[PDB]
Ligand binder design. Sequence first.
Ligand SMILES: *SCC1=CC(C)(C)N(O)C1(C)C
Ligand SMILES: [Cl-]
Ligand SMILES: [Cl-]
Ligand SMILES: [Cl-]
Ligand SMILES: [K+]
Length: 164
Amino acid sequence: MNIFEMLRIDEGLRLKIYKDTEGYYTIGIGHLLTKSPSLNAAKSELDKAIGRNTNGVITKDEAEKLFNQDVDAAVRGILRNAKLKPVYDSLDAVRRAALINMVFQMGETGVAGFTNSCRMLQQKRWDEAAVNLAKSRWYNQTPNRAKRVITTFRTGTWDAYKNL
Ligand SMILES: *SCC1=CC(C)(C)N(O)C1(C)C
Ligand SMILES: [Cl-]
Ligand SMILES: [Cl-]
Ligand SMILES: [Cl-]
Ligand SMILES: [K+]
């Protein structure tokens, strides 16, 4: 298990445009295209991202290329966030993957709340952080994924994924 395998489990793989859990046009391994309700806008985003006329369908290799870029993006963005880099750098590599997972799902900027959860993680108060992370829209709207990510923070193991 590693961040790529972890996110592949949590995001799935679909080769045609679909709507994510929030209703937003997405493709591949959780590649958000746009928040616009226009399918035509989503197809323009897709064609721009792949560099060809796709009409909303891609190959597995193309999906994996966007995924590689999106993981790389998430990591770089954590480092570029002065509010988050210290937390990331304080963690072991397994818990770092849990943090990347959250940023991938929620965004590299603009995420609301979670200051207290990040403090408890920096303090290495793992059970307390896990309780605090669940007091969230995130946990209520995507509870099975959030439970897996939270277990990863609580334990520093891959137990919630190994077997999936
Ligand atoms: S560690 C909690 C946290 C704080 C913030 C910077 C808002 N992040 O996006 C997450 C959710 C990772
Ligand atoms: Cl565009
Ligand atoms: Cl709490
Ligand atoms: Cl879920
Ligand atoms: K998804």
